[PDB]
């Protein structure tokens, strides 16, 4: 069984949204954007305790009661031979499927306001065909979705006491249930019940049991008795981690005959960072949580994400939700933790600049400190990608509606076992981004006596000829916010502030001295930069990726 779609029309802040789903769904977005009201649309559809109160006037879109609320959920049932949950669904909805090979199912909710009694009635309907939905049968307070779906709503604002008061009768459900598997313990759980019987014969309780009755029987000498009982048991972050194991234990024991849906709303509240990493490993690796919908504000819960569906709620003109199926490939699996630790902070941004290493982070963070220091407050982010993995980040950010900007270099890589041949690296990465194929290798005739420095200017002149040869592809890169350098970052920086680079480093070739040690001399450059040098970097036409990153219309 698989979740496939949801469609929400006229629901509070939602007017018409159509969101694809999966079994594991992660919901994120800004503050006051509709993450709570998306989770209540599954509470009103599948949970009876929210559905039994009906809709108010405030549950309609812009408080307009003439329009109707409709919430439709799509299930895929093509795994009937392999899943037990599909057989749990089909044994309730037996007569309403429309063919012998229909693998689609629709669970719908309609609502229409009544103005005289001021009530919103909720009518539930299901069918294999969207034109021919029939009403769900039931008798009394129970309809037929309640025999198949159990919704566990997890909120850290509730304590262990309100679930523990239900657990006082769930212990009696354990002792009666499981085909008397605790019947071996049930004669000596009455031994633990009579441990609570000779707590009644200490004299501090036995004096109270006599003296309260003797004080009570001075009024009318009534035929009463006063008794005392406790019935306890033993087992803001350890209570929550206890309640997670309590919910998993109750889902393993009680609900083997039901389909369990977890609605986990904000599980980073009063948890530690390592407990967020442990909860992420439990949610995305263990098979206890088969179906969940999750809202989060924390990037540490997405450190282990795989085979999931990421939903991003945003507001360009209306409240619109983007949706992306996140999978990591088998070739990328040796570096998957670094991919998720890099990408999980970049998911919560608006404009992401994909840079190569930490030297670009040093230079761009001091330039964006001097020019626009609140760029992180507005939705800007700098992502270090390693120069190797451009398809994964661009596909994940582009499917979620986040603007991706790439600033890169034009590199040549030497091959293995062959002398003199070279592979175009940056042109192949930026043309594999656009869908085109890789290019052929190129050989450069360099003799053995020309080594050291002059080989680098011969490779730079070959990089200039390669950048001149593919000019229309470079214009296609500039159409798609891809910024390929002619040689490197350092030659563009020598084009920007090269008089100050000759002043600071004191040599006649400041490009070569900074490339002698790229991480030590970058700090030595950028510690001596003034305010006018950073504005000359920011207003340059070779550094338009920073002007695209800040979001202003200056360029």
| Footprint of a copy of itself (CB under 8 A) | 30-32, 236-238, 266, 268-275, 277-278, 281, 297-299, 303, 331, 333-335, 337-338, 345, 348-349, 356-358, 361-362, 365-366, 369, 374, 376-379, 384, 386-388, 413-414, 416-417, 425, 450-452, 505-507, 513, 516-517, 519-520, 523, 526-527, 529
Q: Checking DSSP bridges between strand 308-315 and strand 24-29, what pairing results, if any?
A: parallel
203 is in an annotated binding site: no
Minimal distance, residue 400 CB to Mg ion, in Å: 19
C-alpha dihedral, 433 to 436 to 441 to 446, nearest 10°:
-60
DSSP state of 55: B
Minimal distance, residue 286 CB to a copy of itself, in Å: 13
Within positions 39 to 58, which residues make up the interface with other proteins, using CB under 8 A? 57
Nearest alpha carbon to residue 120 among 66, 64, 72, 57: 57
Using only C-alpha atoms, the chain has a radius of gyration, in whole angstroms, of 33
Minimal distance, residue 66 CB to a copy of itself, in Å: 22
Candidates 185-193, 352-360, 468-476, 517-525 — which segment interacts with other proteins by CB under 8 A? 185-193
DSSP string for residues in 487-549 = S-HHHHHHHHHHHHHHHHH-SS-HHHHHHHSTTTHHHHHHTS--HHHHHHHHTSTT-HHHHHH
114 is in an annotated binding site: no
380 is in an annotated binding site: no
Minimal distance, residue 208 CB to other proteins, in Å: 6
490 is in an annotated binding site: yes
36 is in an annotated binding site: yes
> What's the gap between Cα 20 and its chain centre?
14
Minimal distance, residue 493 CB to a copy of itself, in Å: 15
| Binder of residue 227, out of Mg ion, other proteins, ligand ATP, none (CB less than 5 to 8 A by kind) | other proteins
> Between 426-433 and 390-399, two packed helices, what is the crossing angle to 10 degrees?
30
Q: Which of 31, 101, 230, 287 binds other proteins (CB under 8 A)?
A: 230
By beta-carbon proximity to Mg ion, the closer residue of 28 and 105 is 28
Within positions 235 to 264, which residues make up the interface with other proteins, using CB under 8 A? 245, 249, 252
Q: Whole-angstrom distance between the N-terminal and C-terminal Cα of the chain?
A: 51
Where the chain is discontinuous (C–N > 2.5 Å), the residues before each break are 235
Buried b (16+ CB within 10 A) or exposed e, 38-69: bbbbbebbbbeebbeeebeeebbbeeebeeeb
Minimal distance, residue 271 CB to Mg ion, in Å: 11
In sequence order, what are the residues at sequence separation of 6 or more whose Cβ sits closer than 8 angstroms to the Cβ of residue 208? 228
107, 145 contact by CB (below 8 A): yes
By beta-carbon proximity to ligand ATP, the closer residue of 60 and 381 is 60
Per-residue x/- mask for Mg ion, residues 2 to 21, rule CB under 5 A? --------------------
Q: Give burial (CB, 10 Å; 0-12/13-18/19+) of 230.
A: exposed
Size (the chain), residues: 555
Q: Using CB under 6 A as the criterion, which residues of the chain lie in contact with ligand ATP when the complex forms?
A: 12-13, 29, 31-37, 58, 60-63, 236-238, 270
35 is in an annotated binding site: yes
> What's the gap between Cα 275 and its chain centre?
17
Q: Which of 82, 139, 157, 224 binds other proteins (CB under 8 A)?
A: 224
By beta-carbon proximity to a copy of itself, the closer residue of 57 and 338 is 338
Nearest alpha carbon to residue 150 among 291, 5, 3: 291
341, 335 contact by CB (below 8 A): no
531 is in an annotated binding site: no
Candidates 34-42, 134-142, 336-344, 348-356 — which segment interacts with Mg ion by CB under 5 A? 34-42
Angstrom distances, CA of residue 137 to CA of 5, 74, 94, 298, 426 = 24, 19, 12, 42, 62
159 is in an annotated binding site: no
Candidates 32-40, 275-283, 367-375, 486-494 — which segment interacts with Mg ion by CB under 5 A? 32-40
Phi, psi dihedrals of residue 232, rounded to the nearest 5°: -100, 175
Candidates 32-40, 150-158, 194-202, 473-481 — which segment interacts with other proteins by CB under 8 A? 194-202
36 binds Mg ion (CB under 5 A): yes
Minimal distance, residue 117 CB to other proteins, in Å: 8
| Binder of residue 312, out of ligand ATP, Mg ion, other proteins, none (CB less than 5 to 8 A by kind) | none
By beta-carbon proximity to a copy of itself, the closer residue of 120 and 426 is 426
Candidates 31-39, 69-77, 123-131, 417-425 — which segment interacts with Mg ion by CB under 5 A? 31-39
Q: Copy the structure tokens of residue 186.
A: 């049930």
Strand ranges (DSSP E) for 327-473? 351-355, 380-384, 403-408, 412-414, 421-424, 442-443
Cα distance between residue 272 and residue 267, in whole Å: 11
In the complex, which residues of this chain contact other proteins (CB under 8 A)? 57, 118, 178, 181-182, 184-185, 191-192, 195, 198-199, 201-205, 208, 211-212, 215-216, 218-220, 223-232, 245, 249, 252
Return binding residues for ATP: 32-36
Return binding residues: 32-36, 356, 360, 440-441, 490
Return binding residues for a divalent metal cation: 356, 360, 440-441, 490
């Amino acid at each position: 069984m698989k979740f496939s779609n949801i469609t929400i029309k006229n629901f509070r802040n939602f007017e018409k949204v159509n969101i694809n789903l999966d079994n594991k769904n992660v919901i994120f977005g800004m503050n006051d954007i509709g993450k709570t009201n998306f989770l209540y649309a599954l509470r009103f559809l599948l949970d009876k305790e929210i559905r039994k109160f009906g809709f108010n006037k405030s549950d309609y879109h812009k408080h307009d009661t003439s329009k109707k609320i409709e919430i439709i959920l799509t299930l895929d049932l093509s795994n009937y031979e392999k899943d037990e949950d599909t057989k749990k669904l089909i044994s309730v909805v037996k007569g309403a499927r429309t063919s012998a090979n229909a693998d689609v199912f629709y669970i719908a909710l309609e609502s229409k306001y009544d103005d005289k009694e001021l009530y919103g009635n909720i009518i539930l309907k299901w069918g294999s065909e969207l034109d021919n939905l029939i009403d769900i049968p039931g008798r009394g307070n129970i309809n037929a979705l309640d025999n198949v779906f159990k919704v566990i709503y997890i909120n850290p604002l509730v304590d262990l006491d309100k679930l523990f008061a239900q657990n006082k009768k769930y212990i009696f459900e354990e002792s009666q249930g499981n085909e008397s598997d605790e019947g071996i313990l049930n004669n000596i759980k009455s031994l633990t019940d009579q441990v609570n019987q000779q707590i009644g014969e200490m004299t501090i309780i036995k004096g109270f049991q006599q003296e309260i009755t003797s004080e009570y029987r001075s009024l009318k000498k009534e035929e009463v008795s006063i008794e005392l009982k406790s019935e306890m048991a033993i087992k803001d972050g350890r209570r929550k981690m206890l309640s997670y194991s309590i919910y998993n234990y109750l889902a393993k024991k009680k609900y083997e005959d039901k389909i369990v849906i977890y609605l986990i709303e904000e599980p980073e509240i009063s948890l530690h960072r390592s407990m967020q990493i442990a909860l992420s490993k439990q949610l995305f690796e263990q098979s206890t949580y088969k179906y969940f919908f999750l809202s989060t504000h924390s990037p540490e819960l997405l450190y282990e994400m795989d085979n999931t569906r990421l939903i991003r709620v945003h507001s360009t003109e209306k409240v619109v939700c983007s949706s992306h199926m996140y999978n990591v490939e088998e070739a990328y699996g040796s570096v998957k933790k670094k991919l998720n630790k890099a990408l999980s902070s970049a998911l919560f941004a608006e404009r992401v600049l994909l840079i190569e290493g930490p030297s670009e982070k040093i230079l761009f963070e001091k330039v964006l400190d001097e020019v626009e220091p609140e760029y992180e407050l507005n939705g800007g982010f700098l992502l270090e990608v390693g120069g190797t993995y451009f398809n994964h980040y661009v596909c994940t950010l582009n499917d979620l509606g986040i603007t991706h900007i790439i600033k890169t270099d034009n590199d040549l890589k030497s091959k293995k076992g062959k002398k003199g041949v070279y592979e175009l690296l940056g042109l192949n990465r930026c043309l594999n981004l656009l869908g085109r194929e890789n290019l052929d290798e190129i050989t450069i005739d360099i003799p053995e006596d020309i080594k050291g420095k002059k080989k680098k200017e011969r490779l730079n002149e070959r990089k200039k000829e390669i950048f001149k040869q593919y000019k229309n592809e470079v214009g296609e890169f500039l159409g798609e916010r891809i910024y390929l350098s002619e040689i490197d970052l350092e030659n563009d920086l020598y084009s920007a502030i090269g008089e100050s680079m000759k002043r600071i480093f004191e040599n006649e070739d400041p490009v070569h001295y900074l490339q002698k040690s790229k991480l030590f001399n970058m700090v030595e450059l950028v510690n001596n930069l003034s305010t006018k040098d950073c504005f000359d970097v920011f207003e340059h036409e070779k550094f338009a990726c920073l002007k695209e990153l800040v979001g202003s219309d200056r360029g």
